[model samples]
Target chain A: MNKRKINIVLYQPEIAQNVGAIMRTCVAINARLHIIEPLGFIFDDRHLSRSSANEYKYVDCIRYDDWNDFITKHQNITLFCLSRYGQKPISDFDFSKINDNVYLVFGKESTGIAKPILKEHYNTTFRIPMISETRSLNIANTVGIASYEVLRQWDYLDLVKYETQKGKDYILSE
Target chain B: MNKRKINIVLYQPEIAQNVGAIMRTCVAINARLHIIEPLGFIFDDRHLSRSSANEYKYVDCIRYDDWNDFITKHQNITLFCLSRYGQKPISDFDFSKINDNVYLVFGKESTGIAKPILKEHYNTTFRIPMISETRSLNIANTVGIASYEVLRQWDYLDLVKYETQKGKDYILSE
Candidate 1:
């Protein structure tokens, strides 16, 4: 099956490790990554490489000066802003039939994707279901959960369903 | 809809911060947590509470002496060992029909779950789809992704679809 391009765009991330881990997530899920500027940490921080386990080398990461620049460069992408006050749960969003480039946009650690961007695309906003008591899930975990859901819906794209290097079902093997 | 009990079992987790984050994850998903002992880091460290944002107070966490102790205490729980050499992708696992408690077991950060335990439950093992080039997903992220998938299967298990305390659509409201 031909894999459709999926992009996970981080909007002004405040944590270096989160961005680093996200780079690995994009690679695992067969998705690309875009980072908006004004980041809390530098891209070359050792913390990023450590948390990401040095897997950044395997991912395709793009940088955007700002949200406007991102939107300008990727006008044809189907963007979904993950928010706390989203109109619908992410589970309700259909990703199986999307043939175009899809961008799963996430906001900063605390404030979330810029309020204005969410307001502009309010109808396209979605959230991961959670109890009201908590503020949010870990940024990397959230991205991981959301990204895998889309891959699950689309049969995991070109990613391998079983281990090849270690041999699938190798637990009982000698 | 009835909410089934879901448990996340961490076997010898090496990082305190990861355990802390997983605690918050349990609370967010309304799931329980069981920690198999010989943990590499202290469970009550400040880093743990800080990373978990002090949400540990709201979580249900139990510690077991070992894997055998855990298995003996929870005799009826359906165990799914998250392994790289599993028979099926986690996406193929059917979680919707489970009426009893479900346990998602994870191994340590570096070594993973015990080889003996995985061998015993080879047929019940599953894995998340990923590129073989990478070593593995972050343990916290893996738990989050796997736990959420089960939650998603069961319609989010009594999790509120909208925020009532703050109101669901309070983004721009005055």
Candidate 2:
């Protein structure tokens, strides 16, 4: 409701579940989801709508034909590229700079944000530190981490703490 | 390796992949995993290790017989119970209070932390912000978000950006 300024872009994501999970997070936290194709999994209605647990209706999701198409519409937004090859930890990057319209960009599971893109945005790239033992994390999980971090910095703008369908105290009742 | 002071406790996690993903996250961030069984899925070698991408080696995981067993060994630790019915947003809770040995407790995917436990520790319970549409998120993704929030507050005490297994520029190399 707070204008859904944060935009989460998944470049060529291959996993349906990951996109579904990210979709739910975006809807929950009032952000937008942008996908740059070709997605590995089918993004047809039956699959994605079911996967998003019907939360997709609440999300302002946009799909781009490619990076160029995305760039065409998106302007004046700060881009933070999440990558394993990032120069510094994500925590070190300050999110307060952009008051609104910030973009958190992530690549797919098998191959992360294209090497060329990562190389191009090397300075804006950041990583959630992981031991060398694990190659990378589940994309949805990483998105959750980064999303919460940015939202937390913004004091969780336009988010709710209590329930609506049921009262806040419904769970506590006998 | 750092002291791995923070402990992430999952009560009867339902999904094997979720546990595996959380396990890798724990290893990556130097947090120990505490599972209070019985797990919904088999946490055997074939599934867990491979799912974790063999990062289980670096994790300091502990298995407790049940809630009682977990409470017995968990001493002098601040417990932050994560629940849908939590009183406040997770960001409202101060992670800075616990200098070390903080516990981020989650419930099974289906039920969430037991009502009794949530009621007993009502004051310490926290919820991640969400819309009314979805009941919950992937347990692993929630863990990732919560784990990073705490670590971020603690200044990422012992984490690193670049890998020791591979050089910082390895991913950028041709």
Candidate 3:
């Protein structure tokens, strides 16, 4: 496998299905998934298992005991947290400028990452622009949009552009 | 409120949960959701209702009898379909160049947009680039990623940049 550089961190994620969808997205984009503990659903939750399907094995997923454990372990990597409280809209931040491994952090469903944690990374914090009045974008979809932005900025590094198994010209031939 | 130009079309979606998530995303991005029928589940499925919460009311959702009905109704609008068999990666398409209203179409979860239809829109068809061996990104996530790309390219026109109720600096104050 290519050296994984893009990391998606979920801080105390509340939903198994959302995490499952995130897992599938991580595989599609060739990024790793990290979970900070006190997860709302168990690891063996069927919703998580069924939603991700067999693709779960393809992506690298790691778990940490809590926020401190996660931050302490990856001390050198920059953390970009997604929140309604973000300092910048995602499009305004240039992912191409980052030299270190990229870690995109998102908070749990109900409360979001604690205020102090967001305060610590205020500069790097970002939001996915949306119309006001809606509660928030689904967490899984948020992961999809934010991660794709990172990959897009990197010019989709080491990612495949065409269907490999069926061949690039499969559509044409069909 | 701003003239809604972006349209998200789901051709025979099977999952209510996916539709629900897409509906929420449409609300957030200020795009309309169009569903072409022979749906797998009913409109009022509890999963759909619960997943989208009350945000469904905010998005404009129109359902068509079938593909023929959809095409005939929107005959003039350019339809950009998302498929693994797409001729171009989504990033390559320049949304800014288009003068008319934009439509991003995605296929059902099981089979995807039919081959004949894809062949018809061959030039406009685009793929979300991904690694091989994975099945595909979740349909809802696909909608989220594609629609957000359109919004992002258009510089997030008329979209609010910060939280409305809490104020932009709510994070800092708390």
Candidate 4:
């Protein structure tokens, strides 16, 4: 199995706690976290403490002044934007094709990933299905689902999905 | 054949939007909801409109004044409290056994489902596995993990089983 590097990015994230939760997800998957600056909460407050605290050291959380700078610097990597109306269902894609360095980008908690980014990266736009009328999945959960899928497709998921499937198939009577 | 009813309860949820998101999950699985009351935001607030207004009708959000009333009213149901750290992983539990009226109680975002209720309620506690140093799953997403499991175990999982005891074999979507 090829080892793939994954980075999860958030654009102008509104909730620091959500970003923190996503940071932990990124850490678990051994993925990088990139945040666009001017966050919802100050980075040096109780928000950080309540969120992840000292573990930020274990997670590489880089911030860019804007998307242009990020895209300019990381232009070599494939960027996948996630949104509610994304053209492709994430499950349908073969993420391993560009597994070397794939970035899964999410928009702010309220608005989805930037539309321009979507237009630019539309072929890679993917979404997690939800019942109609739902605003969106929790930011962190979206990160988990998309990141986990990429990891699974790349055979980098270790074993969580298979475990869930196995446990689902075989149930112990209680 | 059995029809198990599950309940989703959020205690003093501070972020109205998060609670609203949780409500949408409840609707997807056809589970009822209980909100431990004196919430940070009014139930009728417009915040929920953007996040979960469309799902309100499908979800039943019951309210209680305090911890005492929460337990007092839902006495007939089994209460399962989720914690970030506990003994067994929730994945190991039997989801099919979730009977109608089983209560899954989650604390507020800041303090987690009120521990007073944790100490007092007749309940079993479990945790979802995560990387160490990661604080916790978003309260709403964590609720989804367990509630969705319950549905999956109860044969309410959204998959096609060609043949069943009864002739009608397809599981419908929400």
Candidate 5:
């Protein structure tokens, strides 16, 4: 089990479908997913199966009772919160320069992360650049963009670039 | 009104929700969205409002009767298709080098763009790198990741970097 150094943390995610879609993304990038409670939906096999189409099994998922529990355990790791209130665009951050494991934290769909939490990590908080009129990008999409940017800066550490199951030449020869 | 140089093309998209999510992404990245029919759901205000929450109106959406109608109109511009069969990873491609207006094309959910079309633009086709075990990322997420990558490379073009409605200092002063 090779763990890529990326962690996607969802702070009280409200949508099961978003979490499901996110699980597929986490598997694609080979990153771990941490869910801070209480989740909007029940975390069960039946719910996961419907939302993520069995991709949830491949991802390493962790659950925390609250923000305090999550923060205490990950005190040493660098945390980057994705919020509309963030000062820096994600592209401005240098993911390659980080020495510690990275946590890309996202808030719930409705309210986003609480103000005090964002204020605490204001320097590290980042926004995915968008037109000023929009409220925010979908949380799932935000994760994909933020996670991939980190992987891109790290030169996509150990990810398989070519199709393996169907063979790399499958597209050409068919 | 400023138009972005990037365009997102969906070839025979199936799900209304996916298209809706892509609309939000297009609005964020300031890209146009082209839909090549036949569509899975009716393209109407009711459908758009339910899935996208009025974000669809902000995007410049063009409809094409078929692939030929789309390709014929877009003959001169650079088109990069996102397909699992592609030889190049998206990160390997240099979006900054493209001098022409670019189109990042995606295929339908069930079957991707026809094999013949992929074979035609083999060199320009790219894949978002993923582990081999998963089939594919959600199409909406794919659009988000691909569009943002182009914008990131282009220095985020005219996209706003700071929160505007509440003012940039709102986060800090709260």
Candidate 6:
């Protein structure tokens, strides 16, 4: 886990398929992920299974009882919230702003992140650019864009150090 | 209406939501998009409506029963087929390598652009790097990444001209 670079937070996440797809992105980027619970679909569901594994051996998925529990559990890091209502552009941001411990938060599929979770905890909320008529983007797609933006800003200059370092502390979704 | 800077194409596109999202992206970059049909969707669908209306208006979607018809419509410019399987990285590509009429062709949703699309029309094919364990990226996300790369190469000096010239043409993806 010491080799890991970034952490992603999924709050009140509803879709397992969305989670699976996002988990795939997390593994692709070699980032750790936090999954807040009251999840809508079971892990064994067909949609989730289609995108993820029977046993997600590579992904590190942790389920908190609630958002507050998540705040208590992951108390060490600064949280970055992704929100459409926010004015800041993630594209304009530089990763030097991130410290060693960072958590990126996302809202639920249908309504987006709860205002309290966003207003109370988020150090900042950043957005992806969409045309005015285009109100928002798909969650999985937004996560992909935001995740990569985080990676680019906090770019792995020493790829070999992360790649070949040693045993990964990744505790697959249980 | 002759403000055609680049061509962003979706060949044999499936999933209306993804197509609609890319159409929105076209509005952001002020680029034109072509869809080589035989699509998996109805032209008028609920998802498309949820995405936006103005985006659809700005987008001029030409329908081709087949790729041959597509070729005949815009036969003069070179087409760049984007695929992870390509030998070159898309970032290495320069805007100077392209003329105004150049069309950047992309494949279908699931399988991506077939080998023949690359073999026949493409002068060069390029890839976006991804973790090898996965199959591919979300269609809209793929489009966004490729589109950004194109803008990055072209907008390197500054985005002054793009900013000042916004009102002259219908532009998308700012």
Candidate No. with top TM-score: 1
Candidate 6 residue lDDT tens string, A32-145? 788887878776546665564432457777778887898787666667777655545555656766556557788886888887656564336666554352444557667776
lDDT of 2 by residue, A1-174 (tens): 344377899999987877888887787777788999999987866777855767666678888999989878876555799876677776677776656577899998887888777766777788887646344677888888888887777777766665443534555664
What ranking of all candidate models by lDDT puts the best one first? 5, 1, 3, 2, 4, 6
Pairs in steric clash, model 1: A107-A113, B107-B113
Candidate 6 residue B11 Cα shift, in angstroms, is 1.9
Error of 6 at A167 (Å): 30
- Native-to-model Cα distance after best TM-score fit, residue A109 in candidate 1, in Å: 0.8
Task: Assess each model's interface with DockQ, reporting 2 decimals per model.
Answer: 0.65, 0.51, 0.61, 0.09, 0.66, 0.13
* TM-score of chain A, every prediction, order shown: 0.90, 0.86, 0.87, 0.83, 0.89, 0.79
Model 1 C-alpha lDDT per residue in residues B51-95, reported as the tens digit of each score: 786888788889999888988987765679998777677768888
Global Cα lDDT for candidate 2 = 0.77
Preferred candidate (DockQ higher): 1 or 2:
1
Which residue runs of candidate 3 sit more than 4 Å off their true CA positions?
A1-4, A45-47, A162-173, B1-4, B45-47, B162-170
Please provide, for model 5 over B11-95, each residue's C-alpha lDDT reduced to its tens digit, 9 standing for 90 to 100: 9989888899888777767688899999998887778764576887777889999999987887766678888777767778887
Q: Can you list the residue pairs that collide in candidate 5? A: none
Instruction: Give one digit per residue, the lDDT tens place, for model 3 in B1-174.
Output: 345478888999898888988888887777778899989988874567677866666668898999999888877667899887776578788987765578898888888998888767777888888876345888888888888888787878877665444644665666
Candidate 6: stretches off by over 4 Å: A1-4, A51-58, A96-101, A120-123, A154-174, B1-7, B14-31, B40-60, B94-102, B119-124, B149-174
Question: Candidates 2 and 6: which is better by lDDT?
Answer: 2
Specify the poorest-scoring 10-residue window by lDDT in model 6 chain B. B156-165
Worst 10 residues of 4 chain B by lDDT: B165-174
lDDT of each: 0.80, 0.77, 0.79, 0.64, 0.81, 0.63
Can you list the residue pairs that collide in candidate 3?
A: none
Across residues B23-100, which tens digit of lDDT does each residue of candidate 4 receive?
A: 777765567888887788878746676556467656777888987797787566667877543334454567665555
Task: Compare candidates 1 and 6 on TM-score and give the better one.
Answer: 1
In Å, residue A65's CA in model 2 sits off its true spot by 1.7
Writing each residue's lDDT as its tens digit, candidate 1 over A12-125 gives 999887898888787777678888998998778466778777877777888988888988987765688888877767778888878667788998888898777876777678
Worst 10 residues of 5 chain A by lDDT: A160-169
Which residue pairs clash in candidate 2?
none
CAPRI verdict (incorrect, acceptable, medium, high) for model 1: medium
Over A43-122, each residue of candidate 3 has an lDDT whose tens digit, in order, gives: 86456768886666676889898888987888766788887767667778887776557888999888788888787777
